Amino acid sequence: WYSPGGGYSQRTDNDTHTHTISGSVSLGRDDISRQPINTLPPFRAAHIWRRI
């Protein structure tokens, strides 16, 4: 709307909204993807466990 004033008629079918309308949305993301477990840099690492 350009806010044009009619010469004889009145544009009563146009109005400015004041507040938004809340609606129900559909589903979204399901879950997270794969993640890493354990440390690869530590695999096969030699560990000293000999007693005194």
Add this chain to the structure above:
Amino acid sequence: YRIGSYYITEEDINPGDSISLGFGSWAKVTGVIMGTGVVNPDGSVPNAQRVEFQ
């Protein structure tokens, strides 16, 4: 290394009465391995020498 349950010195009359008796800590390990090396058997770097503190 000698192991005994009697609290008598090696030089005492009750003991053998020879040599010097000294307290020993831990168990004697055969020279070649030191124990814990590798989770899957690969082997670590062992220690050797007598009297050496490492």
